[PDB]
Amino acid sequence: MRITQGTFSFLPDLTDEQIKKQIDYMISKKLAIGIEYTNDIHPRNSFWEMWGLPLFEVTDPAPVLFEINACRKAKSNFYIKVVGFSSERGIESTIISFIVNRPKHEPGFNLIRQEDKSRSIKYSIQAYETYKPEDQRY
Amino acid sequence: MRITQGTFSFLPDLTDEQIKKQIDYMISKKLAIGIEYTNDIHPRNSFWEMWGLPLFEVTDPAPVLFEINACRKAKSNFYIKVVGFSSERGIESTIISFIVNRPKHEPGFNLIRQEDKSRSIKYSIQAYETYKPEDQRY
Amino acid sequence: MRITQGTFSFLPDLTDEQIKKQIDYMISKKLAIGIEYTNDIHPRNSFWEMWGLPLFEVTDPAPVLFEINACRKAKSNFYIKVVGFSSERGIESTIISFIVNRPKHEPGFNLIRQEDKSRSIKYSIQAYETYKPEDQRY
Amino acid sequence: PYAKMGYWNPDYQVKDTDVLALFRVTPQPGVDPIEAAAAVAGESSTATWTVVWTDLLTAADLYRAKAYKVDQVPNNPEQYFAYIAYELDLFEEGSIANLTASIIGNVFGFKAVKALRLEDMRLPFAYIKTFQGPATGVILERERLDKFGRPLLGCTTKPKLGLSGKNYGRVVYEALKGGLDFVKDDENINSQPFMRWRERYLFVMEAVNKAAAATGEVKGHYLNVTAATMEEMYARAQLAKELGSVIIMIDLVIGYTAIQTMAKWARDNDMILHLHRAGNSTYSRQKNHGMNFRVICKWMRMAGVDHIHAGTVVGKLEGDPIITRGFYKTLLLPKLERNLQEGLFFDMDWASLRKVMPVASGGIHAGQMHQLIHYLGEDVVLQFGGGTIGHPDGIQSGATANRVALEAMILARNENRDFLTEGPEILREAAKNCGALRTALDLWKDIT
Amino acid sequence: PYAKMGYWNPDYQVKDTDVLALFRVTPQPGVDPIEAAAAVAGESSTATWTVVWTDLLTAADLYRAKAYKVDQVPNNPEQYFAYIAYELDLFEEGSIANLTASIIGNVFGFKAVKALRLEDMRLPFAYIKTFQGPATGVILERERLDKFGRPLLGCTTKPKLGLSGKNYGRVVYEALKGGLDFVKDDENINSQPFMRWRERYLFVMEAVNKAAAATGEVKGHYLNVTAATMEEMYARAQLAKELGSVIIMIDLVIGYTAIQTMAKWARDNDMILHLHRAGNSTYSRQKNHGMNFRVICKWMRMAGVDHIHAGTVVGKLEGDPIITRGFYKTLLLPKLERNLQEGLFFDMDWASLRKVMPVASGGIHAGQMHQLIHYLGEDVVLQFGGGTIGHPDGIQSGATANRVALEAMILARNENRDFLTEGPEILREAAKNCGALRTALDLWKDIT
Amino acid sequence: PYAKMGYWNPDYQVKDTDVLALFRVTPQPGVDPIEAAAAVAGESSTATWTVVWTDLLTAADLYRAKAYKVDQVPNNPEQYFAYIAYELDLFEEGSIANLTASIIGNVFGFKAVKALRLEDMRLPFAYIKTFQGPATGVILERERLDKFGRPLLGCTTKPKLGLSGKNYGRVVYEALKGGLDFVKDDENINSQPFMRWRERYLFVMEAVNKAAAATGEVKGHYLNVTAATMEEMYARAQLAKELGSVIIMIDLVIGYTAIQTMAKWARDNDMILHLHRAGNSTYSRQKNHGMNFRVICKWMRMAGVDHIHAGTVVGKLEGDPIITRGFYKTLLLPKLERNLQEGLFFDMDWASLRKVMPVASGGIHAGQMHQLIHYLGEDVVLQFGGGTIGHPDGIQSGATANRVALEAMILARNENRDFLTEGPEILREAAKNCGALRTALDLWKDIT
Structure with a gap:
């Protein structure tokens, strides 16, 4: 399956040309830019791993693309996303987050149903790769 | 003081001519007519004493006025009222009730304040004449 | 006993000269001036009877003293007080209230103790004169 | 398509x-x-x-x-x-x-x-x-009050806002003792920096019981329990019940779920529930868009309020007499018959739901009593305003003048006098014996 | 005078x-x-x-x-x-x-x-x-969903009424798994003889968790908790919370006291609160009488709902674009500047109250995506209807077509293409890679 | 840097x-x-x-x-x-x-x-x-007590500790009946081996109601509800409310969260809340370090206490008259104007929060009444101590002497006599008619 977290995940995976134009937009919006990666693709895994520190005051997409590519080489079989943080008062949060690398095959999620009172169920979702240690996924 | 229970108590006490015209109205409304009397004038004294049974199917005010006058003589120092009961479905209740006799002097009511939690008070009202036995009031 | 509601009740009863100087003060404070009277001296009897309407925009103590004296004659065996209402924002209330007439003898108050749970008691206080009808007190 | x-x-x-x-x-x-x-x-x-x-x-x-x-x-x-x-x-x-x-x-x-x-x-x-239909309903309401065969009388406290809890209670006491059956909170008085709600309730109940003791009648004041959230409304309702109030009021703007919640509460707590229709004109006024007020009357009788403002035919709302009659019918009859002039388009059986008491207010005075009785009938609460509080002789006098006029008009109606035609004279005869009422007639004869 | x-x-x-x-x-x-x-x-x-x-x-x-x-x-x-x-x-x-x-x-x-x-x-x-202002607000809502930089997408279940709890859940599952972020209860579905409320909630949460597991996204369904009394609304709200729903919805007709009650509840219970504006047009539609909808937007942002239907510029409600913009501003900005054309007559500071998410629905389709983005901006929930459920290829296909169009339009906007002018072409390029979307464009090109 | x-x-x-x-x-x-x-x-x-x-x-x-x-x-x-x-x-x-x-x-x-x-x-x-600001506030407090146009008078029980619940009640009864408006618990009396709290409350309320019955005034005793934990404070507060006390007191050392908790409680329970400032001097006394007491007055008016000890100008705390005036202003005015001599450095609008009643205590006697009135004004509770209880003629006499002096001084002020200059003579004229007061003046003339 195809995991559809991310702003453009219903599109084909972005080319580097496409990514570069998204960095331009981020820059024009004055965002801090973070590159983050993970191999527990659970939708409530809020804290992916950080690839270095966010880049602030970026003025050219080049350094950003370089780190993205450095991350892809070191972590080719992890999901990797780019995140743009706005520091505008009242927002002070993420305003864009999209996937720039996927592992080659995504097996998806186990759905667990624990039967509770009457007819209610307590659900968990667990990504299949996380039944394996980190250094063995994907 | 003047007790103002009753439909016409803010008017002067009714003459017998006036009462007779109220019986006419009751009759035209097809009411049962009851004459009731009391010497505990508390506003929550819901059950005054009955002077005989209500009169049904009355067609002339005469018999009613006669009982009213019979009640006044026997109970001259009691309040006496005339009550018209409607049996119309959905009403089935009193639709008029007015005073036709008052005692000569009404001393009124004691107000009792029992102090309860914080600033709240539990009130009673007690007619002064009821500090006396029935056969000694008014 | 001497009832000590009122701003100056621990002083001797005021002379008319004294009262007049209190009206001067009220006037200088721009108060509405009310004359109120009662023969249920309970301390929680918040609503004494009104002797006419409060006097507004008074500029001379004379009209006020005249009403005070008119009230004393008509109600000589009632307590009578003078009350000054401030309309100043954030106050909007009484700022002075003193006695200008007392009945000739005050018998005082009955204390009633209703025994409630454990050792608690529910108290009432009842002025002795209110065991009598209004038109017979004092 | x-x-x-x-x-x-x-x-x-x-x-x-x-x-x-x-x-x-x-x-x-x-x-x-x-x-x-x-x-x-x-x-x-x-x-x-x-x-x-x-x-x-x-x-x-x-x-x-x-x-x-x-x-x-x-x-x-x-x-x-x-x-x-x-x-x-x-x-x-x-x-x-x-x-x-x-x-x-x-x-x-x-x-x-x-x-x-x-x-x-x-x-x-x-x-x-x-x-459920009305918590109380006209019939039980009158049995609770022991007041039968006549409209009931009320007025809203004036000034609407600003009096201290103690000065507020003063007006309540004077109005009730003068002859009014009810006084009420304005729809705008809830709990504000100039006056919080609890002291209002506490002073008011002393006023109300004082006036019962002065007149020998059951009296009441609609305490407004309107508040931002349901728990806050329940707190207010609970105090009114604890102090023994016969009646509370709610504003229609609390919305329908809160009103049905309160209607259940009033049924279970032996409380008369007055609905103040504040805001209703924004959709019930224009003839081409929105909802007609009769449909609101239906919904509110179902929901179970006991009183609702329903229109005066004369005064600051001289609306159509035949349309208003339609409103009163909806509120009060066991069955409705279609009558196009009244604006009742369907027959409708009320399935023995209780009746709601209509309330007339808005620039009315004693000088109109004969039209009021003629148009609005006997089951209605006539609410006066400056009609009562601004009598030159005082609040008690204002109240008495209204009560004397009301009773004299009903007495006349029951005598079968042509009270609509003879009404001004009927007023004059009553005023012969009642100074307070003569003063009121003189004062409000040219009222335009 | x-x-x-x-x-x-x-x-x-x-x-x-x-x-x-x-x-x-x-x-x-x-x-x-x-x-x-x-x-x-x-x-x-x-x-x-x-x-x-x-x-x-x-x-x-x-x-x-x-x-x-x-x-x-x-x-x-x-x-x-x-x-x-x-x-x-x-x-x-x-x-x-x-x-x-x-x-x-x-x-x-x-x-x-x-x-x-x-x-x-x-x-x-x-x-x-x-x-309190919004229980959740746009910013936290997006952090909860982990969905940033794009509108969110939803639709109402079709048929609005009649499906069994199990058949109902089917539609929810298909729509969420196909790409919609949300599905919702109709404002008319509460608890009725054809379907009581509890089985709806229970089937729905199985649908919702199934779709999370199928897509790897947080998904939700607005469970409608609208009921006659407050205690009944609390029971429904409580079940939605117990089952772990991310979101519930209320109809505006429950009235303002119940809405502030629920808004507090949602704040204290980590629940997104969607307000459905059913009935609002009876007073907000005519230009000469009633209340303008922007004043409702102010009151509801204060009261603390998280989403409110705010208008579409194109479709079954082609209302003024500049007036609608005014609504979105009220809902979303920290400060309002007076602008007579927008109908904002006063400057107004929102005192750091949270933002409310506007919702556009009413005859919209993927073929309008470029106007939708252009007029309504990025913080909005675009709600489709027959747009999704009646795709010839199935509900999942209906959903996917909408999601692909949305994302392609935002991608274009961020590339600084002139998407308003170039929009139909941008759609066509996306449809080249997406059959479901080609079918939708063909099907809804002449939509009048 | x-x-x-x-x-x-x-x-x-x-x-x-x-x-x-x-x-x-x-x-x-x-x-x-x-x-x-x-x-x-x-x-x-x-x-x-x-x-x-x-x-x-x-x-x-x-x-x-x-x-x-x-x-x-x-x-x-x-x-x-x-x-x-x-x-x-x-x-x-x-x-x-x-x-x-x-x-x-x-x-x-x-x-x-x-x-x-x-x-x-x-x-x-x-x-x-x-x-919330003051639970009660000066204005409602005086309406509750029906005491207007003069300071109120109180004193703390002497000995502070040791009397049995029955012997304790004796002092309360004598003081209230003699003329004091209030008596109080010491800040140190909570519940101790020599006297547990419940019997104190129960004897005290009998004292208080006995004195109401003896004088015809609303009387009160500040029951100290100070305790180690909040649940224990609530138990004590609840008993005071159950027995119908008009007033309770708390020590400032319970800390700010407990004080705001109690302030809400007092608002919801119609209770006057007296704050005893015990401990405050450890940070408000030295001129170079800590916090000035006026900042405490601001915080405590916000939090919502009804009385707070604010300073006497004369006596065991002869502090600056102009600085003290600043404290009273903070406590009592609707608006503060910057005045450097008073130590008020900012204008400040109180946004219609209620007023707090200042309390003066600490070695004061009737012989100073003219300075007390002159410095502290009319809205203040003057708390006597050995001033009352150790009158040679008895507690009732001690109380009466204070009350006579107070009233005579206010009467003089309202006559526009130069009471500050003429005060000793004004006292002497009052003492002519009041033995208890003559004895007090003689006894405390050389007080150094």
Whole structure:
């Protein structure tokens, strides 16, 4: 399956040309830019791993693309996303987050149903790769 | 003081001519007519004493006025009222009730304040004449 | 006993000269001036009877003293007080209230103790004169 | 394409269980009346804009409203009366919010109609029977008060706002002792920096019990329990009950779920519930758009309020006498008969739900008593205002003048005098014995 | 005699703490504009019709509303804009019912005005600060969903009514798994003989968790908790929380006290609260009478709903684009600047209250994506209808087509393409890689 | 390096919403005034000692306090007045603990300042509006007691500790019946081996009701509800309410969260809440370090106590008359005007929060009545001590002497006599008619 977290995940995976134009937009919006990666693709895994520190005051997409590519080489079989943080008062949060690398095959999620009172169920979702240690996924 | 229970108590006490015209109205409304009397004038004294049974199917005010006058003589120092009961479905209740006799002097009511939690008070009202036995009031 | 509601009740009863100087003060404070009277001296009897309407925009103590004296004659065996209402924002209330007439003898108050749970008691206080009808007190 | 989609059916046979709505419809310049009607049915029932196959997993026809009759309105060629029927099963038992959502949901914002006004509804007996109806109702209310055969009298505290809790209580005491049956909180007084709610309630109950003791009558003051959240309303309601108040009031703007919540509360707590209709004119006033007030009267009798402001025929709201009569009928009768002039478009049986007491206020005075009685009848609360509080002789005098006029008028009516014709004279004879009333007549004769 | 009674004051100096209202006023044929304005101020503040001496026991001027400016409206000589100021002390902190009562109380039924419409209000900072504002708000909502930089997508279940709890859940599952972020209950589905509420909730949560597991996203369904009484609403809300729903919905017809009650509940229970505006058009539609919808947007942001239907510029409600923009601003900005074309008559600071997510629905399709993005911006929930469920290839395909179009449009916008001009082509390029979307474009090109 | 890090800004423009603090600053021998000021701003806001990149994920400037003006203090070259501004958004609405933490947190232990004293604060209107303010307040308190136009009189039971519940009640009864409006528990009497709390309350209420019955006045005794935990305080509070006490008291050492908890309780339970300021002098006494008492008066009026000990000008605390006046102003006025001699450094509007009753105690006697009235004014509770209980003629006589002096002084003031100059004579004339007062004057003439 195809995991559809991310702003453009219903599109084909972005080319580097496409990514570069998204960095331009981020820059024009004055965002801090973070590159983050993970191999527990659970939708409530809020804290992916950080690839270095966010880049602030970026003025050219080049350094950003370089780190993205450095991350892809070191972590080719992890999901990797780019995140743009706005520091505008009242927002002070993420305003864009999209996937720039996927592992080659995504097996998806186990759905667990624990039967509770009457007819209610307590659900968990667990990504299949996380039944394996980190250094063995994907 | 003047007790103002009753439909016409803010008017002067009714003459017998006036009462007779109220019986006419009751009759035209097809009411049962009851004459009731009391010497505990508390506003929550819901059950005054009955002077005989209500009169049904009355067609002339005469018999009613006669009982009213019979009640006044026997109970001259009691309040006496005339009550018209409607049996119309959905009403089935009193639709008029007015005073036709008052005692000569009404001393009124004691107000009792029992102090309860914080600033709240539990009130009673007690007619002064009821500090006396029935056969000694008014 | 001497009832000590009122701003100056621990002083001797005021002379008319004294009262007049209190009206001067009220006037200088721009108060509405009310004359109120009662023969249920309970301390929680918040609503004494009104002797006419409060006097507004008074500029001379004379009209006020005249009403005070008119009230004393008509109600000589009632307590009578003078009350000054401030309309100043954030106050909007009484700022002075003193006695200008007392009945000739005050018998005082009955204390009633209703025994409630454990050792608690529910108290009432009842002025002795209110065991009598209004038109017979004092 | 609504008329072809099943939403128009001049043949449809209305059932006794159907909810029926009467809409006053103003189609867009080009669009056909039947198409307008069908659009309103469709848009408020199963209004999907492509074909959906999921419809076929259900008994689809049942959930479609049906426009089944259109007539052009008597004097205005550009308006039509559209009759629509809804299956009883579409609605949640006992729920005003569901009925409202379902009926007035989308269709007022729809484009193929210029304007749209819900005018009447036929609530079927079986639906009406799932509602509590008035917590108390006229009949028990009068048995509780021991007040029969005459309107009841009230007024709102003046100034509406600003008096301290103690100065507030003063006005209550004077008005009740002077002869009014009730005094009330303004719809705007809840709990504010100049006066919090608890001291108001506490002073008020001393006023109310003092006046009972002074007159020998059951008296009351509508304590306004209106608050931002339900728990806060319950706290206020609870204090009024604890202190023994006979009556509380709520503003219509708390909305329908809070009103049904309180109506249950009042039933279970032996409390009269007065509904203040504040805000209602924003949708009930214009003749071409919104909802007619009679439909509000139906919903509020179902929900279970005991009093509701229903109109005065004379005064600051000289509205149509025949339309107002229609409102009072809805509120008070066991059964409604269709009467086009009154604006009652359907017969309707009230399924023995209790009656609601109508309330007339808005620039009325004792000098109109004969029209008031003539138009509004006997089961009504006549609410005075500056009529009472600004009597030159004082609040007690203001109250007495009103009470004397009222009683003299009812006495005259029951004598079978032609009170409407003879009313000014009947007032004059009463004023002969009542100074307070003479002063009031003199003072408000030229009232324009 | 209102203009002479103190209710007109062109000199009055407005304070930062004053509540200010802007009314669109249509005087009676004879009556003067200033007299009309003063009448509206007077009638909604201290509006007594004789003199009362009890006023003098208070600081009377404070409790008087003041009409302080009148202008004739740009194109209609018979209408005036009246500006009125109310002292902050007149109102209960945190209470919409009190604000509403106080402002829109009597004045809509008053005779010396033909028609009257509340158009805007300036809520002062110090009053706004006493309200909770949105339980969740746009920013936290997106952090909860982990969905950033794009509108969110939803649709209402079709048929609105009739499916069994199990057949109902089927549609939810298909829609969420196909790409929609949300599915919702219709405003009319509460609990009815064809389907009671509990089985709906229970099937729905299985659908929702199944779709999370299928897509790797947080998904949700607005469970409608609308019910007749507050205790019944709490029971429904509690089940949604117990089953772990991310979101519930309420209908505006439950009324304001129940909405603030629920808004507190949602804040304390980590629940997104969607407000469905069902019924709003009865008073917000006509341009001459009632209340403008922007004033509702203000009150509902204060009360603390998280989403509210705010208008689509294109489709079954092609309303004014510049007026709609005004609505979205009210909902979303930290500060409002007066702009007469948008219908924002006052500057207004929102005192750091959270943002509400606007929702666009009503005959929209993927073929309009470029106008939708252009008009409505990025923080909006685009709600499809027959747009999704009646795709010839199935519900999942309907959903996917919408999601692909949305993302392709945002991608284009961020590339700085002229997406409004180039939009149909941008759609075509996306459809090259997406059959479901090609089918949707072909199918809804001539949509009239 | 604070002055260069953004924490010093002599240009900063203060907003109406900003919280402003005035600190009396004593820099370390070498350090510059501006650097001292900036350090205090920095150290209490965003005070990190290296660079942090996480700042840039926020609107960092908003969360920085700003030192915006420094002046050297009038007579002491080594001290500066530093003005600092904090954004309203930094604070939790209605929370004294948050305000306190935020303002006085770190900076008193900081090294680059020798000494530091918070002198005044400007609480902005919009923040003040989120607090309840006094449960009761002066105005309602006097309406509850029906006592107007004069100070109220009280005293603390002597011996403070040791009397049995029955012997304790004796003193209460004698004092109230003799003329005092109140008697009180000492701040040290809670529940101890020599006397547990319940029997004290039960004997006391019999005393209090006996004295009401003897005098015809509402009387009260501050029952001290101070206890180790909140549940224990609630138990005590609940008994006082159950027995019908008009008043309870709390010690300031229970701390701010418990005080706001009780203040809410007293508002909801119609109870006067007296705050005893025990312990306050440990930080409010020295002129160079700590917090000035006027800032405590502000916080406690916000939190919502009804009485607070505020100073006597004469007696065992002959403190500055002009500074004390400043305290009474804070407590009692609707608005504060900056007046450097009083120690009020900012204008401040109280946003219609209720007034707190100041309490004067500490070695006062009837022989000072004319200075007391002159300095402290009319809204104050004058608390006597050995002044009352140790009258040679008995407790009742002690009380009467105080009450006679008080009333005679107010009567004189209202006659416009020069009571300050003529006071000893005014006392002498009153004592002519009052033996108890003659004995008191003779006894306490040479009091040194």
